[PDB]
Write an enzyme that holds these catalytic residues in place. Structure first.
Site, PDB file in Angstrom:
ATOM      1  N   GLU A  89      -6.676  19.793  -8.081  1.00 31.21           N
ATOM      2  CA  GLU A  89      -6.496  18.545  -7.339  1.00 31.21           C
ATOM      3  C   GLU A  89      -5.147  18.498  -6.618  1.00 31.21           C
ATOM      4  O   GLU A  89      -5.066  18.002  -5.499  1.00 31.21           O
ATOM      5  CB  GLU A  89      -6.722  17.327  -8.240  1.00 31.21           C
ATOM      6  CG  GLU A  89      -8.202  17.113  -8.560  1.00 31.21           C
ATOM      7  CD  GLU A  89      -8.462  16.376  -9.861  1.00 31.21           C
ATOM      8  OE1 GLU A  89      -7.516  15.822 -10.471  1.00 31.21           O
ATOM      9  OE2 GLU A  89      -9.640  16.357 -10.277  1.00 31.21           O
ATOM     10  N   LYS A 128      -6.275  12.389 -15.987  1.00 30.86           N
ATOM     11  CA  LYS A 128      -6.129  12.193 -14.551  1.00 30.86           C
ATOM     12  C   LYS A 128      -5.653  10.756 -14.293  1.00 30.86           C
ATOM     13  O   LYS A 128      -4.905  10.210 -15.109  1.00 30.86           O
ATOM     14  CB  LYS A 128      -7.423  12.564 -13.808  1.00 30.86           C
ATOM     15  CG  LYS A 128      -7.889  13.985 -14.125  1.00 30.86           C
ATOM     16  CD  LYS A 128      -9.116  14.387 -13.344  1.00 30.86           C
ATOM     17  CE  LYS A 128      -9.557  15.797 -13.716  1.00 30.86           C
ATOM     18  NZ  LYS A 128     -10.687  16.235 -12.840  1.00 30.86           N
ATOM     19  N   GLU A 156      -9.957  27.122 -13.882  1.00 29.42           N
ATOM     20  CA  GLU A 156     -10.847  26.137 -13.271  1.00 29.42           C
ATOM     21  C   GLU A 156     -11.817  26.791 -12.291  1.00 29.42           C
ATOM     22  O   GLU A 156     -11.407  27.185 -11.203  1.00 29.42           O
ATOM     23  CB  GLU A 156     -10.039  25.125 -12.461  1.00 29.42           C
ATOM     24  CG  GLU A 156      -9.001  24.313 -13.212  1.00 29.42           C
ATOM     25  CD  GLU A 156      -8.402  23.250 -12.307  1.00 29.42           C
ATOM     26  OE1 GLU A 156      -9.077  22.221 -12.072  1.00 29.42           O
ATOM     27  OE2 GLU A 156      -7.287  23.468 -11.793  1.00 29.42           O
ATOM     28  N   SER A 183     -16.810  22.597 -16.430  1.00 31.28           N
ATOM     29  CA  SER A 183     -17.560  21.578 -17.156  1.00 31.28           C
ATOM     30  C   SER A 183     -17.882  22.032 -18.577  1.00 31.28           C
ATOM     31  O   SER A 183     -18.460  23.103 -18.796  1.00 31.28           O
ATOM     32  CB  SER A 183     -18.828  21.169 -16.402  1.00 31.28           C
ATOM     33  OG  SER A 183     -18.500  20.345 -15.292  1.00 31.28           O
ATOM     34  N   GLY A 198     -18.887  20.179 -10.301  1.00 28.45           N
ATOM     35  CA  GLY A 198     -19.540  19.087  -9.581  1.00 28.45           C
ATOM     36  C   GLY A 198     -20.082  19.493  -8.221  1.00 28.45           C
ATOM     37  O   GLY A 198     -19.988  18.729  -7.254  1.00 28.45           O
ATOM     38  N   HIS A 238      -2.859  22.164 -11.003  1.00 25.50           N
ATOM     39  CA  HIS A 238      -4.236  21.675 -11.081  1.00 25.50           C
ATOM     40  C   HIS A 238      -4.844  21.732  -9.683  1.00 25.50           C
ATOM     41  O   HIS A 238      -4.157  21.476  -8.701  1.00 25.50           O
ATOM     42  CB  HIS A 238      -4.308  20.245 -11.631  1.00 25.50           C
ATOM     43  CG  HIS A 238      -5.690  19.825 -12.024  1.00 25.50           C
ATOM     44  ND1 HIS A 238      -6.601  19.321 -11.120  1.00 25.50           N
ATOM     45  CD2 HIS A 238      -6.324  19.852 -13.219  1.00 25.50           C
ATOM     46  CE1 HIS A 238      -7.731  19.043 -11.744  1.00 25.50           C
ATOM     47  NE2 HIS A 238      -7.591  19.358 -13.020  1.00 25.50           N
ATOM     48  N   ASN A 285      -7.107  15.942 -19.993  1.00 30.10           N
ATOM     49  CA  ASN A 285      -6.437  15.535 -18.769  1.00 30.10           C
ATOM     50  C   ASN A 285      -7.065  14.223 -18.333  1.00 30.10           C
ATOM     51  O   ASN A 285      -8.186  14.212 -17.826  1.00 30.10           O
ATOM     52  CB  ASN A 285      -6.603  16.607 -17.685  1.00 30.10           C
ATOM     53  CG  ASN A 285      -6.001  16.196 -16.342  1.00 30.10           C
ATOM     54  OD1 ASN A 285      -5.298  15.183 -16.234  1.00 30.10           O
ATOM     55  ND2 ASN A 285      -6.285  16.981 -15.308  1.00 30.10           N
TER      56      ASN A 285
END
Lengths: 254, 254
Positions: free
Chosen positions: A97, A11, A167, A212, A173, A95, A9
């Site tokens: 996001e 992005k 996810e 990750s 992060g 997703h 991806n």
């Protein structure tokens, strides 16, 4: 039984120059890879270009989103029919996001899933729980809710040939780590959930890890029986790093 | 003093076959046009293809929307930097379909306007009042507010080289239509509003009519002094119809 899939991806990253370099380098880095399928999702305006550059390689194309209409008076929208026409196969929907930044509801994402299946495209359905949901012990509840948006409204056959990417938003992060064992626990739950409706369908769904992954992570993650590959973020922008993940998936599944 | 611009908003309509046929037909129909600039905005995935098909002609490229970020972890978004890279110049923002269906605010659209200016792209700022607003007599208040989002944050200088498109949203699907007299009154109001801040900028802004424009009604609209062209919907999908509109603009402003 399940052939692994590693998907990149990109992005919001890309340019004419970048597309040529990255796709060229990816082909070179992925030479001899036969035991893991590979897809990339560039920004929409570069799908056509990327597909062209991918000729001679085994790299499959994809996209980062779709809207609900095939054609008509919908300025600025993305059509599943047009994604198919331009040669994108694997279409990322839901997703984190987009769920967060653009407030996409479970119901909306399920509608996107339906339009993709109707066109004969492959949904990559992203699901996953937040920091607060993970801390509250609601991982399973959240994952089931996000899957059920499709499963309860469209039936188990909706997941024939489909992909799910888990996810761990709480771990991405954030200072928190998710172990391979923890990832496997969730993937196992997801497959079991679908299996309650149709065991045959559940056995063939590709469930990717969307947390990750790097070279330190890959082999331990891909050794897990219910992890079928990875949806890769930042590492997909570096041909060598991305290929390391692909090769780890191939090696793990043997 | 103002050179007209006729722009085709293809909306959610396109395919590789369609792009080749339509752009080829456009090239032929528009080859002898001198006195009117022409832009097209295909769906995002087809901008690159259309740009390549238009090479050698005076047909300029455009897009139907943009987001706020240039790059980064923004799955499914559209970057102004990438629109520039791929060859789009005229970027439609704030189309009524996006203000309504996607809840885009005046403030968000003004932010998009700013990002486009920073990239040296040409905003096509869509403004216009709904049925309820029009019936309440708020045409001027609404147009002023939508313009002021940019004008009161970025100054009149922001409108240098920029395009405004007035859409009478109240005329969409209502079985109603604006007369050239009504359209002209609104265009004159928009220009006078900008002139209050900077008279010289006002005189150079291209204000397009964005209501229903077709081969039949183009001439009467373009006879009006403050109508500088059109943002064309459905007629942009047929080269012959679109060419009649372009030529009518050329003839009116010659």
């Amino acid at each position: 039984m399940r052939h692994p899939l590693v998907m990149g991806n990109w992005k919001l990253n890309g340019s004419r120059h970048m597309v040529h370099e990255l796709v060229s380098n990816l082909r070179k880095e992925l030479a001899g890879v036969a035991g893991c399928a590979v897809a990339i999702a560039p920004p929409e305006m570069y799908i056509d270009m990327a597909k062209r550059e991918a000729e001679g390689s085994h790299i499959m194309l994809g996209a980062q989103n779709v809207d609900l209409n095939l054609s008509g008076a919908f300025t600025g929208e993305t059509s599943a029919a047009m994604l198919k026409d331009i040669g994108a196969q694997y279409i990322i929907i839901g997703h984190s996001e987009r769920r967060t930044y653009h407030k996409e509801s479970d119901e909306l994402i399920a509608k996107k899933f339906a339009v993709l299946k109707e066109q004969g495209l492959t949904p990559v359905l992203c699901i996953g729980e937040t920091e607060a949901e993970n801390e509250a012990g609601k991982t399973e509840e959240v994952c089931a809710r996000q899957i059920d948006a499709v499963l309860k409204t469209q039936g188990a056959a909706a997941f024939e040939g489909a992909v799910i990417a888990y996810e761990p938003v709480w771990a991405i992060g954030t200072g928190k780590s998710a172990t391979p064992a923890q990832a496997q626990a969730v993937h196992k739950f997801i497959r079991d959930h679908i299996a309650k409706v149709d065991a045959n369908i559940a056995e063939q769904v590709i469930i990717q890890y969307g947390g990750s992954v790097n070279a330190s992570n890959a082999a331990e993650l891909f050794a897990q029986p219910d992890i079928d590959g990875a949806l890769v973020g930042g590492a997909s922008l570096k041909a060598d790093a991305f290929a390391v993940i692909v090769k780890a998936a191939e090696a793990a599944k043997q």
